């Protein structure tokens, strides 16, 4: 998870191929609510076929899953059992001699 | 040509290129078990009806049958319920509750289990880390009936 978050911290933005959010003319708003965004999106989708299922953003390698000490010591302290273990040393005590 | 050839009616038929093939592809289509033919024919009927509606010397006659996204939406929603025996459900039983991830920390974490396998952090291996599937105590008394539907519509695609 730490390696993934470091890798995600490298992949943390659209480093290449930003959105082509060019703005055309401010159309003469005699009517309507200047909702140009939907028409622009429909036009660009029709003209470019952005979903042609071939292009990719590829802002990072999708590889090079580096691993390192750097975060391993976040082991900190384990919430282990056997902090008190009298039951389990009595478990050994059953086999103190070879019996059973 | 395939949409036309069987209608002997002289007035041609077409869609118009403001259609969103992408918005059909998932939101309109879900699991639907082919026979999309049924969809397109259901639309073609309804579009023809409004054409013959205006044909009664109404304000104008566009001289072609023109399909529209609204009739596709109506058609697909009908196709999910005319098959009334079907156990399934539409994708959008949710309104005003669009995944308000800032309303609390827990809402700020439901998105983890969907955003990750959406591959936005990585094209995951599909073969290592166990999935962070959620087992929701949530708000124990009431909420849950809504909760899953709310996220499912707004950051996912079916229910
Ligand atoms: N946090 C909330 N904010 C707003 N409305 C809520 C909230 N929690 C519950 N509701 C109301 O109740 C509905 C969702 O909770 P509901 O009472 O239906 O759950 P439930 O039947 O107890 O759930 P379960 O499926 O676990 O039995 C919402 O549609 C809304 O009317
Ligand atoms: Mg309930």
Curated annotation (Swiss-Prot), chain A:
Location relative to the cell: Cytoplasm, Cytosol; Peroxisome membrane
Induction data: By oleate.
Superkingdom of this protein's organism: Eukaryota
Quaternary organization: Interacts with PEX6; forming the PEX1-PEX6 AAA ATPase complex, which is composed of a heterohexamer formed by a trimer of PEX1-PEX6 dimers. The PEX1-PEX6 heterooligomers associate with the peroxisomal importomer via interaction of PEX6 with the peroxisomal membrane anchor PEX15.
Role of this protein: Component of the PEX1-PEX6 AAA ATPase complex, a protein dislocase complex that mediates the ATP-dependent extraction of the PEX5 receptor from peroxisomal membranes, an essential step for PEX5 recycling. Specifically recognizes PEX5 monoubiquitinated at 'Cys-6', and pulls it out of the peroxisome lumen through the PEX2-PEX10-PEX12 retrotranslocation channel. Extraction by the PEX1-PEX6 AAA ATPase complex is accompanied by unfolding of the TPR repeats and release of bound cargo from PEX5.
Comment field (misc): Present with 2100 molecules/cell in log phase SD medium.
Family membership: Belongs to the AAA ATPase family.
Recorded domain comment: AAA-cassette D1 is required for interaction with PEX6. ATP-binding in AAA-cassette D2 is required for interaction with PEX6. ATP-binding and hydrolysis in AAA-cassette D2 is required for proper function in PEX5 dislocation.
Protein name as annotated: Peroxisomal ATPase PEX1
Origin species: Saccharomyces cerevisiae (strain ATCC 204508 / S288c) (Baker's yeast)
Taxonomic placement: Eukaryota, Fungi, Dikarya, Ascomycota, Saccharomycotina
Encoding gene per record: PEX1
Shown residues in whole-protein numbering: 922 to 1021 of 1043
UniProtKB/Swiss-Prot annotation, chain B:
Residues binding ATP, per UniProt: 138-145
Signal peptide start and end residues: none
Top-level taxon: Eukaryota
Subcellular location: Cytoplasm, Cytosol; Peroxisome membrane
Family in the record: Belongs to the AAA ATPase family.
Subunit structure: Interacts with PEX1; forming the PEX1-PEX6 AAA ATPase complex, which is composed of a heterohexamer formed by a trimer of PEX1-PEX6 dimers. Interacts with PEX15; anchors PEX1-PEX6 heterooligomers to the peroxisomal membrane and mediates their association with the peroxisomal importomer. Interacts with UBP15.
Role this protein plays: Component of the PEX1-PEX6 AAA ATPase complex, a protein dislocase complex that mediates the ATP-dependent extraction of the PEX5 receptor from peroxisomal membranes, an essential step for PEX5 recycling. Specifically recognizes PEX5 monoubiquitinated at 'Cys-6', and pulls it out of the peroxisome lumen through the PEX2-PEX10-PEX12 retrotranslocation channel. Extraction by the PEX1-PEX6 AAA ATPase complex is accompanied by unfolding of the TPR repeats and release of bound cargo from PEX5.
Note: Present with 1630 molecules/cell in log phase SD medium.
Domain text: AAA-cassette D1 is required for interaction with PEX1. ATP-binding in AAA-cassette D1 is required for attachment to PEX15. ATP-binding and hydrolysis in AAA-cassette D2 is required for release from PEX15 and proper function in PEX5 dislocation.
Name of the molecule in the record: Peroxisomal ATPase PEX6
Source organism: Saccharomyces cerevisiae (strain ATCC 204508 / S288c)
């Amino acid at each position: 998870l730490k390696s993934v978050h470091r890798w995600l911290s490298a992949a943390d933005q659209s480093e290449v191929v930003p959105g082509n959010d060019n703005i055309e003319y401010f159309s003469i708003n005699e009517h309507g609510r200047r909702e140009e965004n939907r028409l622009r999106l429909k036009t660009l989708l029709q003209q470019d076929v952005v979903h042609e299922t071939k292009t990719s953003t590829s802002a990072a390698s999708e590889l090079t899953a580096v691993v390192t000490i750097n975060d391993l010591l976040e082991a900190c302290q384990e919430t282990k059992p056997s902090i008190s273990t009298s039951e389990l040393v009595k478990l050994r005590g059953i086999y103190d001699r070879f019996q059973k | 040509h395939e949409l036309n050839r069987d209608v002997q009616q002289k007035v041609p038929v077409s869609y118009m290129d403001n259609i969103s093939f992408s918005s059909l592809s998932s939101y309109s289509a879900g699991l639907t078990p082919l026979d999309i033919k049924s969809i397109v024919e259901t639309a073609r009927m309804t579009a023809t009806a409004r054409f013959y509606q205006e044909s009664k010397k109404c304000g104008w006659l566009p001289q072609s049958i023109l399909i529209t996204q609204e009739d596709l939406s109506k058609a697909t929603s009908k196709a999910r319920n005319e098959f009334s025996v079907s156990i399934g459900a539409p994708q959008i039983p949710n309104v005003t509750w669009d995944d308000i991830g800032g309303i609390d920390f827990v809402k700020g974490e439901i998105l983890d289990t969907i955003d990750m396998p959406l591959k936005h952090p990585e094209l995951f291996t599909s073969g290592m880390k166990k999935r962070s599937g959620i087992l929701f105590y949530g708000p124990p008394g009431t909420g849950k009936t809504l909760m899953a539907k709310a996220i499912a519509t707004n950051f996912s695609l079916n229910f």
